[PDB]
Each structure stands twice: as C-alpha cells, then as structure tokens.
Structure 1
Amino acid sequence: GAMGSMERASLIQKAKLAEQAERYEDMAAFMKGAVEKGEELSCEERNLLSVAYKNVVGGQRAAWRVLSSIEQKSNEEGSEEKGPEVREYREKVETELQGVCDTVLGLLDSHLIKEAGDAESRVFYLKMKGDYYRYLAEVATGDDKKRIIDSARSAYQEAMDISKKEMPPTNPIRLGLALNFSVFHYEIANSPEEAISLAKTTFDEAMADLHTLSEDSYKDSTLIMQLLRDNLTLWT
C-alpha cells in the first residue's frame, strides 16, 4: 500500500484537508491507508471513510447512469449504429466502479466488521456493506445479480436487527440505515410496499422519540426524517 509509510494520524489529518479541498479520491486513499494500520476507527474516522468513498462512488454512479442511458437509446428502433464505443466506455466506468465497491467491501471484511463490537460501529459498517453491495447490484446483469442483491439484503438486515435492539429510534445511524434499506427495497428489490412500510414505521417511531432529544440531536434526527418523508412523497 502506497500509504504504508505514513503515520496514522498524518493520514487522518490529510483526509480532512482533502475533504476541504474536495479531493475525494485522495481522501479515500488516505482513509484506506488509515484503516490498513489495523486499529479500530473512531466515530469521526468512520465518517471520514464514509464521506470519502461515498463521493468517489457517487461520481462513478452518476457517470454510469449517463452512459447507460446513452447506450439504451442507441439500442432502440431507428437508432443509428455507432459501433462498440458506448458499450466499451460504459464498461470501463462500470469496472472502475466495481473496483471501488470491492475495495470498500474488502476493508469491511479485512477486518473492520469482525473487530466492531459496539452497536454504533457495527451497525455503521454493516450498513456500509449493504450500501456497496447495493451499488454493485445497480450495475449487475449476470449470473450473480441475485447473489449480490441477497448480500446487500443480508448486511442491511443484520444491521437492522442490531439497531433495533441497541439504539433509540431517533439514532441518526439507525435512521440512515433504515433510509438506505428502504431505498434498497424500492430501487433494487422490486419491493415498493416494503420500502413504504419501512419508511413510514421508521418515521413514526422516530417522531415519538424526539421529545427525549437535545436541540442539537433533534436537528440531526429530523434532517434524516425529512429524507424519509421526501421518499414517501415520491413513492405515494
């Protein structure tokens, strides 16, 4: 690893600088280096890891959707034949995206999840595992699409079971997990009713627990609740 010679603390410091500079590829490489030091991650460090890779894969997903749309239009009746280039370049971006997902899943499997014992870390990492299998599922078309989807489902479900046992209904990690699992149901699993039910129950149980929160926690929780509500408005 090219970050093997850099101090753990220096990698974290530079990941924060890269975030300020909107250099998310650098940020992700710095945080990968920090994970590979072998120590567990603090809450702030887990969030740096997540922000870095979410921005990297987000750019790849947006590009893949543009190119896939062009490719699908090229295959409609009346469309002029343009040769292999659209497919080739969509495949190039797709392969790079799969590489980033495999990198994140590899960090989770070696060895972030197995060392994560507290609910906040374990739920965070299992949600991340669900998310990056979900991104693999968005582009999957072959023999393994069903297995990729089930891997995402399984990780989200384990995270859900822990979060319901160990976290209050307003906990932002729990809320963000439920949000993303509801997106999985709607966009990946062809289960819009499950998506709507999950989002509604999550919203309502959080609403009833807001009275326990400080002003700052109330702001954290309601920001995510608003995304649940936005989706319910889109879906119903």
Structure 2
Amino acid sequence: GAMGSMERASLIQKAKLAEQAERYEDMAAFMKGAVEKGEELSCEERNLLSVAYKNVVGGQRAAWRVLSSIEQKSNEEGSEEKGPEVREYREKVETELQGVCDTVLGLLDSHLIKEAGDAESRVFYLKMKGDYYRYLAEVATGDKKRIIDSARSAYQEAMDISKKEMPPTNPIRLGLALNFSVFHYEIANSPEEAISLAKTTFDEAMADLHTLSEDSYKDSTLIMQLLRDNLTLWT
C-alpha cells in the first residue's frame, strides 16, 4: 500500500492537516493507511476515518444525483437523442462511488469490526457498515435486495448493542438512529418505520438530557435537532 512506509502517527498527523486543507481524498488515503497498520483506532481516529470518507463519498453522491437527473430527463418523451455520453459518465461516477464504498467496507471487514469489543467502537463501525451499504443501495438497480438487507442487518446489530450498552443521549446512538430512520424512509420504502424510530429516539433522548453536563447536552441536542428536522419534512 502506498502508505506502508509511513509511521502510523505521521499518517494521523497528516490526516488532520488534510482536514484543515479540505483535502478529503488525501485525508481518506492517510486514514486507510493508518487502519492498515493493524492496531485498533481511538475515538478521535475513528472520527477522522469517518469524516474523511463521508466527505469523499458525499461529493460522489452529489455528482451522481446531478448526472442521474440529467440522464432521466434524457429518457423523457420528446427529448432529443444525444448518444451514450450521459449514461457513460454517470456510470463512471457510479463505479468510482462503488469503489470508495467497497474500500470502506473492506476496512471494516478486515479487521476493524472483529476487533472492536467496546460498545462505542462496535456501534460506530456497524453504523458505518450500514451507511456504506446504504450508499451502495442508492445506486443499485440490479443484488439490490441483498445490498439493502446488508445495510439493514448492520444497522439492526448496531441498534441492538446501542440500546443495551449506551444511554439514549449518546451521540453515536443518536446518529445511528438518525441514519437508520433515513434508511427506512429513503431506501426500504418504510416511511412509517422511519417516523416511529425518529420519534421514539427523540423522546427517549429528551427524557435523559437532565443527566448531562452542559457540553454533553450541546452534543446530544445537535443530533436531536436533525431528527426533528426530518420529522418536520416527513409529517
């Protein structure tokens, strides 16, 4: 791997510099190198891994959505034939997106999840596995059912652990629930399930805010507001 000669600590340090420079593909490559050293990741390092790949895949998803919209308009009645180029370029972007998802899923399978024993690490990684299968599902049109079921399975395992091992205000638990609710609404065609999950999660967090410090309260309420924003859109 191109990062095999670089110290782990140097890869972490450069990931943080890349973040400051908004060089997210570099950040992801540094964090992939750090994972491939074989040691478990700290909380801070997990979050660098997630921020890096989320920014890379987010750019790809946005591009794919633009291209797919253009392609769909091209396939409307009375649209002029323009040749294979829009499909080809949408496919190019799609294939690159799938490649990034496969890279992340591969890091999780070899060997982040199997060595993660604490609830905070294991839930974090299982949520990531659900997220990247969800991004694969957004572009899938052929195995689609199996991709969807892989996302669902990862999210459900993360949910089961989080409900047993973490308080209802924990930010990783809250972000998991937020994302699993969007899976239900956008991917699984289950808007009622999405709404029920978001509601239950919000209400259970609200009842436990009284236990928190001012700083923890800020962290939890930020995610709660995201649940509220989706519930406003959906109801």
| TM-score interval for Structure 1 and Structure 2 normalised by the shorter chain | over 0.9
Give, in whole Å, the separation in 1 of the partners of 2:81 and 2:64. Answer: 20
- Structure 1: how far apart are the matches of 2:203 and 2:83? 52
Q: Distance in 1 between matches of 2:132 and 2:183?
A: 11
Deviations 1:1-29 (A, max 9, x none): 00000000000000000000000000000
**SS of 1:228 mapped into structure 2:** helix
Shift of 1:118: 0.0
User: When the two structures are superposed, what TM-score results if normalisation uses the length of structure 2?
Assistant: 1.00
Q: How far is 1:232 from its partner?
A: 0.1
How many angstroms does 1:76 deviate by? 0.3
Gaps of 5+ in 2: none
How far apart in 1 are the matches of 2:53 and 2:182? Answer: 19
Tell me by how many angstroms 1:33 deviates. 0.0
State how far apart, in whole Å, the 1-side matches of 2:197 and 2:113 are.
Answer: 25
**Secondary structure of the corresponding residue to residue 76 of structure 2:** coil
Aligned length: 235
The residue number in structure 2 matching 1:148 is 147
Measure, in 2, the Cα distance between the counterparts of 1:52 and 1:101: 12
CA drift of 1:127 comes to 0.1
Displacement after TM superposition at 1:79 (Å): 0.2
Q: Deviation digits for residues 29-85 of structure 1, max 9, x if unmatched? A: 000000000000000000000000000000000000000000000000000000000
1:82-117, CA deviations, whole angstroms, 9 ceiling, x for partnerless residues?
000000000000000000000000000000000000
Q: Report how far residue 206 of structure 1 moved.
A: 0.1
Note the alpha carbon deviations across 1:159-192, whole angstroms, 9 max, x for none.
0000000000000000000000000000000000
The aligned residue for residue 90 of structure 2 is: 90
In 2, Cα distance between equivalents of 1:76 and 1:52: 37
Q: Return the offset for 1:126.
A: 0.1
Distance 1:185 1:80 in 2: 37
SS in 2 for 1:184: helix
The structural deviation recorded for 1:148 is: 0.0
CA RMSD of aligned residues (A): 0.1
1:221 offset after TM fit, Å?
0.0
Q: State the alpha-carbon separation in 2 of the partners of residues 55 and 135 from structure 1.
A: 13
Q: Which residue does 2:199 correspond to in 1?
A: 200
Q: Deviations over 1:121-146 (max 9, x none)?
A: 0000000000000000000000x000
What SS does structure 1 have at the residue aligned with 2:77?
coil
Question: How far apart in 1 are the matches of 2:231 and 2:182?
Answer: 11
Q: Which 4+ residue blocks in structure 1 deviate beyond 2 angstroms?
A: none
3-state SS of paired residue (2:38): coil
Note if 1:105 corresponds to 2:111: no
Structure 1: give runs of 5+ residues left out of the alignment: none
Query: How far off its partner does 1:230 sit?
Result: 0.2
How big is the shift at 1:153? 0.0
